[PDB]
Design a protein around this nucleic acid. Structure first.
Ligand SMILES: [Mg+2]
Ligand SMILES: [Mg+2]
Ligand SMILES: [Mg+2]
Ligand SMILES: [Mg+2]
Ligand SMILES: [Mg+2]
Ligand SMILES: [Mg+2]
Ligand SMILES: [Mg+2]
Ligand SMILES: [Mg+2]
Ligand SMILES: [Mg+2]
Ligand SMILES: [Mg+2]
Ligand SMILES: [Mg+2]
Ligand SMILES: [Mg+2]
Ligand SMILES: [Mg+2]
Ligand SMILES: [Mg+2]
Ligand SMILES: [Mg+2]
Ligand SMILES: [Mg+2]
Ligand SMILES: [Mg+2]
Ligand SMILES: [Mg+2]
Ligand SMILES: [Mg+2]
Ligand SMILES: [Mg+2]
Ligand SMILES: [Mg+2]
Ligand SMILES: [Mg+2]
Ligand SMILES: [Mg+2]
Ligand SMILES: [Mg+2]
Ligand SMILES: [Mg+2]
Ligand SMILES: [Mg+2]
Ligand SMILES: [Mg+2]
Ligand SMILES: [Mg+2]
Ligand SMILES: [Mg+2]
Ligand SMILES: [Mg+2]
Ligand SMILES: [Mg+2]
Ligand SMILES: [Mg+2]
Ligand SMILES: [Mg+2]
Ligand SMILES: [Mg+2]
Ligand SMILES: [Mg+2]
Ligand SMILES: [Mg+2]
Ligand SMILES: [Mg+2]
Ligand SMILES: [Mg+2]
Ligand SMILES: [Mg+2]
Lengths: 142, 117, 150, 23, 102, 109, 55
RNA sequence: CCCGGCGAGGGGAGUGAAAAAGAACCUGAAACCGUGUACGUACAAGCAGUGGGAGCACGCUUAGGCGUGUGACUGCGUACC
RNA sequence: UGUAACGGGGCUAAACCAUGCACCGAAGCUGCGGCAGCGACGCUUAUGCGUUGUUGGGUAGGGGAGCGUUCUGUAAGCCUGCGAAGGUGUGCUGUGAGGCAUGCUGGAGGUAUCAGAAGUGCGAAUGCUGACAUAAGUAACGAUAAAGCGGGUGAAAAGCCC
């Protein structure tokens, strides 16, 4: 007997809110990636996103230990010849403070179509006020 | 004797092309490339009759890990608790129970916890 | 193969294959690669082997009960109508009548029947003595073949 | 009528080397 | 009210009145097999786990039909080294129908 | 009744005629005759003649009215290419191909 | 200057997708001579915007 | 007899066992080129398959069950001599 | 060329040490069937019936067992116009080369069984011939002496005739 395979028409999704005013970036992002792939759900399948929508309010006070707030650097290539742009942690915070959590979970998540779908279910905010209160999201200690 | 060999080649190439229907491109109309597609496809079938059991072992293990952490135990502590309570229920059955009928899985979790502690 | 002897093109410097005779067995209207010959295929069975085979099938005919023995075979005039009449009287369809002595009237009467065979006891052969279903033997032919095999 | 003006392609004449050769 | 039972290595989760597909039992074509190695009964939060077998339990079943399963081809092939090898296989399977559950 | 009309060994090539086929595959026949009147290719001449023949056969044999007709199916198949030789530089020949088409027009209501 | 592999009928159909024609949209039917012609073009009989200009 | 250019080619009628035997003529395969229908395909990376697999449509019945066509998504997977 | 000397996200442990307990982890081993070979040993031999232990990755190569095609004998026998070969589909079956049955097309041959003989099996030889692709409806239309208008002809005139 072919065991259970969760059909994407009948699987249901919840809504979670994560506080991030001092969580460590790597551990927080790993737990976001775990709930986003859906591995807290017993109807789990690889080829079907059984994930859960996660709203990370206050995504700029994510605290990083070590000397990483002045030493951890981020690289992205433009596409031209000399274009290797590079910004530290505090400078990436000062430019666009949600890109840090988005790059972290975009590193941890799978790659390709389903990985980009699981990332599409992750929307983060640099403040304390979201606009998805019509969804009834529940808080989650993560 | 002069064995003319049209019909033999037609029968053989028809068998291989019928095996190679469904494939993209010239790999379902050309014979010289449908033979490579057939032989490489049979090679992958021979590898995947071993790989399917690997993949489904990992799928059952992931599902039991998810249901066990929903009931308050890790998977390794779960399986050691089951072997210490002397249950031989394999993990295909465990994962199918974990999806269909979850209160029996809570029964398995409490018996494993009472064994391990 | 009736052709030329030149190379159809030069060896190096053309985008075509290497080729040096238009007669070649890989070409079109080239030779057969391993062409045959008028030959002789006569297998040589030994004298005692051939006689042992004839002894074997005569013993097999008498064990399988297919060698009807008669004192003589005789028709008056060479009428195949009378020969088929006589054979239907004797109740046979496929029949080999190997003769004690020479009967040219039976030659003439069996030349046109398409199932009956008339021989000598000397000129017998295992293909005939196996293939024909009911072998009729003259007692004089029995004497001649007991001489012939001894 | 039916002329059928399709004679066979006897095309290749010769060649040469005539190229800057690495040597 | 299902039951999990073991028939030659592979374990099955079957309910009453189901059919299931075992590997070839040496039992005649219309006879009943009574499996003894019942490992789990479940009756709507009325479970009892076998340790390693349930004591009070058998599973009765009738052998519906024997047969040979789907042919699967096996091609071994070593590239550039002049060897390939076709083969066939057809497993003998045996359908049983579960009636008794305890 | 679907009335068919063919033109075999049309002296043009299939890839050229299939454009003017794809223009009017599916229309009504009067509007298709307008389109093939004011389309300015040689395939318009050819398929306009074949649509004239198909309308004429459908009205005369089966006896249906001209407004009812509608080009359900129309296609252009490859035909027997005739093979000439164009001589080109440095002695080499080049076999050039003169292709042909089998133009089929189904017309019905 | 010459190709490296043989391109599929998929690629050939995709390239030929653009070379297909567009029809003439709608012929102007002249008011007083009832016949079709192109926009701003004189007809076969010779009319254009009503009057016969030509022989 | 009709379309057409008093052409080519076709459509009906006719001989015909057969015209999908019509001279470009028995059988009529494959590459190749189209048409009609079902499914997929315009956020997507690579020997193009294979294991899994939802959906859709078409065929069947102790509704259950399936097959046949497709294959989104996914683990593996760097042609042949 | 572009971080680029963890594989990557990232980690002050998710680093290193020392002691464990668990688990994951291969086509290994065990379980369940299935096939073959080689050994033992009795048998009850149509010369393999019951077990039995053990073996089966494979190039060059050596050995063994077969399938299929054409023709000859078996064959003036059998199937076949109530439809043979061949072609195209499906379903069953065989360890594989394969085999059988059938629906459509075809319109006259085919051949069991056991033997015999081979021009006996194609994917590769810059192989040979035929056919059809591809580049592609792309380059080109062959002197940079040059054309334009009216009238005729026709279904159709830039090129023909005036
Ligand atoms: Mg021959
Ligand atoms: Mg095909
Ligand atoms: Mg394993
Ligand atoms: Mg010489
Ligand atoms: Mg010749
Ligand atoms: Mg010759
Ligand atoms: Mg002698
Ligand atoms: Mg010259
Ligand atoms: Mg190359
Ligand atoms: Mg174009
Ligand atoms: Mg005519
Ligand atoms: Mg032809
Ligand atoms: Mg004939
Ligand atoms: Mg024909
Ligand atoms: Mg074909
Ligand atoms: Mg899409
Ligand atoms: Mg691509
Ligand atoms: Mg599958
Ligand atoms: Mg640099
Ligand atoms: Mg383990
Ligand atoms: Mg093993
Ligand atoms: Mg075994
Ligand atoms: Mg071996
Ligand atoms: Mg013969
Ligand atoms: Mg028929
Ligand atoms: Mg033959
Ligand atoms: Mg046939
Ligand atoms: Mg004949
Ligand atoms: Mg080879
Ligand atoms: Mg070749
Ligand atoms: Mg070419
Ligand atoms: Mg082209
Ligand atoms: Mg170009
Ligand atoms: Mg250009
Ligand atoms: Mg140009
Ligand atoms: Mg010129
Ligand atoms: Mg010029
Ligand atoms: Mg003029
Ligand atoms: Mg001019």
């Amino acid at each position: 007997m072919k065991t259970f395979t969760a059909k994407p028409e009948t699987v249901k999704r919840d809504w979670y809110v994560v506080d991030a005013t001092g969580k460590t970036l790597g551990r927080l992002a790993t737990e976001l990636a775990r709930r986003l792939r859906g591995k807290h759900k017993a109807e789990y399948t690889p080829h079907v996103d059984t994930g859960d929508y996660i709203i990370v309010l206050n995504a700029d006070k994510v605290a990083v230990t070590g000397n990483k707030r002045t030493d951890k650097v981020y690289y992205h290539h433009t596409g031209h010849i000399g274009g290797i742009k590079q910004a530290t942690f505090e400078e990436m915070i000062a430019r666009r403070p949600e890109r840090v959590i988005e790059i972290a979970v975009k590193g941890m998540l799978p790659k390709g179509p389903l990985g980009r779908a699981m990332f599409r279910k992750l929307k983060v905010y640099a403040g304390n006020e979201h606009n998805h209160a019509a969804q009834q999201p529940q808080v989650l200690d993560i | 004797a002069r064995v003319k060999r049209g019909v033999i080649a037609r029968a053989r190439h028809k068998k291989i092309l019928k095996q190679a229907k469904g494939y993209y491109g010239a790999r379902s109309r050309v014979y010289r490339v449908a033979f490579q597609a057939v032989i490489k496809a049979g090679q992958y079938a021979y590898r995947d009759r071993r790989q399917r059991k690997r993949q489904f072992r990992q799928l059952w293990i992931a599902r039991i890990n998810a249901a066990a952490r929903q009931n308050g135990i890790s998977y390794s502590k779960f399986i050691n608790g089951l072997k210490k309570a002397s249950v031989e229920i394999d993990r295909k059955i465990l994962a199918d129970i974990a999806v269909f009928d979850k209160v029996a899985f809570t029964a398995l979790v409490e018996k494993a916890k009472a064994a391990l502690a | 193969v009736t052709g030329s002897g030149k190379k159809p093109w030069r060896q190096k410097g053309t985008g075509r294959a290497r080729s040096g005779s238009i007669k070649s067995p890989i070409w079109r209207s080239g030779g057969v690669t391993f062409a045959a010959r008028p030959q002789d295929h006569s297998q040589k069975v030994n004298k005692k082997m051939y006689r042992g085979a004839l002894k074997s099938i005569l013993s097999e005919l008498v064990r399988q009960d297919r060698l009807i023995v008669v004192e003589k075979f005789s028709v008056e005039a060479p009428k195949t109508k009378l020969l088929a009449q006589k054979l239907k009287d004797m109740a046979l369809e496929d029949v080999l009548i190997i003769t004690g002595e020479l009967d040219e009237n039976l030659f003439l009467a069996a030349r046109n029947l398409h199932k009956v065979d008339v021989r000598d006891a000397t000129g017998i052969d295992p293909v005939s003595l196996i293939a024909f279903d009911k072998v009729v033997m003259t007692a004089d032919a029995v004497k001649q073949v007991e001489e012939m095999l001894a | 009528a039916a002329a059928a003006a399709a004679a066979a392609a006897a095309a290749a004449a010769a060649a040469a080397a005539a190229a800057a050769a690495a040597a | 009210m299902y039951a999990v039972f073991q028939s030659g290595g592979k374990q099955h989760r079957v309910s009453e009145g189901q059919t299931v597909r075992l590997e070839k039992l040496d039992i005649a074509t219309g006879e009943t097999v009574e499996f003894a190695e019942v490992l789990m009964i479940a009756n709507g939060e009325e479970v009892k786990i076998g340790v390693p077998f349930v004591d009070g339990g058998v599973i009765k079943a009738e052998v519906v039909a024997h047969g040979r399963g789907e042919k699967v081809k096996i091609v071994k092939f070593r590239r550039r080294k002049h060897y390939r090898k076709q083969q066939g296989h057809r497993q003998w399977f045996t359908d049983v129908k579960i009636t008794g559950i305890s | 009744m679907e009335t068919i009309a063919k033109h075999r060994h049309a002296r043009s090539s299939a890839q050229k005629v299939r454009l003017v086929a794809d223009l009017i595959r599916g229309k009504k026949v009067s509007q298709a005759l307008d389109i093939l009147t004011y389309t300015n290719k040689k395939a318009a001449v050819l398929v306009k003649k074949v649509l004239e023949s198909a309308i004429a056969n459908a009205e005369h044999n089966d006896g249906a009215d001209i407004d009812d007709l509608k080009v359900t199916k129309i296609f252009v198949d490859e035909g027997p290419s005739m093979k000439r030789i164009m001589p080109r530089a440095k002695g080499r020949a080049d076999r050039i191909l003169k292709r042909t088409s089998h133009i089929t027009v189904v017309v019905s209501d | 200057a010459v190709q490296q592999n043989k391109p599929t009928r998929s690629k050939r159909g995709m390239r030929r997708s653009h070379d297909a024609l567009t029809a003439v949209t709608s012929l102007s039917v002249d008011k007083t001579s009832g016949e079709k012609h192109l926009r701003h073009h004189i007809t076969a009989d010779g009319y254009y915007r009503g009057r016969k200009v030509i022989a």
